[PDB]
Amino acid sequence: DSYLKHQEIVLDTLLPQTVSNQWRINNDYIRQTCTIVEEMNIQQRKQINDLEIYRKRL
Amino acid sequence: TSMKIQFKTAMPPTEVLLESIQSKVESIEQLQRKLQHVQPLEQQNNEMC
C-alpha cells in the first residue's frame, strides 16, 4: 500500500507540469491577441476616416 | 476429515485476514481507482498541451 501512494503521487506531479505548460502557451497567445486587436482597430479607424473624407472632398 | 479440518482452519485464517485485509484492500483498491483518474486527466492535459 505504501508503494501505491508513491506511484499515485508521481501522476499528480505530471498533472501540474502539463497544467503549468498549457497555461504558458495560452499566456503567450493572449498577449499576441491584444496586440493584434489594436492593429486591427487602428486599421478600422483609419479606414472610416478615409471613407468619410473622400465623400467630403467630392 | 480434511475438508472439515482444513476449511475450518481456512475460514478462520480468511476471516482473521479479511477483518484486517479487506480494510486495507479498500485502502488499496480505492487508491488504484485514483490512478485511473490521474491517468485520464493526464492524457487530456497532454492533448491540450
Side-chain angles (χ1 to χ4, degrees), chain A residues 2 4 7 10-11 13 15-16 18-20 26 33-35 46 51, chain B residues 1-2 9-10 12-14 20 23 25-27 31 34 37 40 43 49:
Chain A
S2 297
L4 183 52
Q7 181 185 1
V10 199
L11 294 174
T13 296
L15 295 173
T18 58
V19 245
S20 296
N26 290 318
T33 262
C34 295
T35 296
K46 290 179 182 178
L51 294 174
Chain B
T1 293
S2 294
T9 287
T14 275
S20 296
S23 66
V25 254
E26 291 179 353
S27 297
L31 266 298
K34 186 174 172 66
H37 292 287
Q43 294 294 321
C49 184

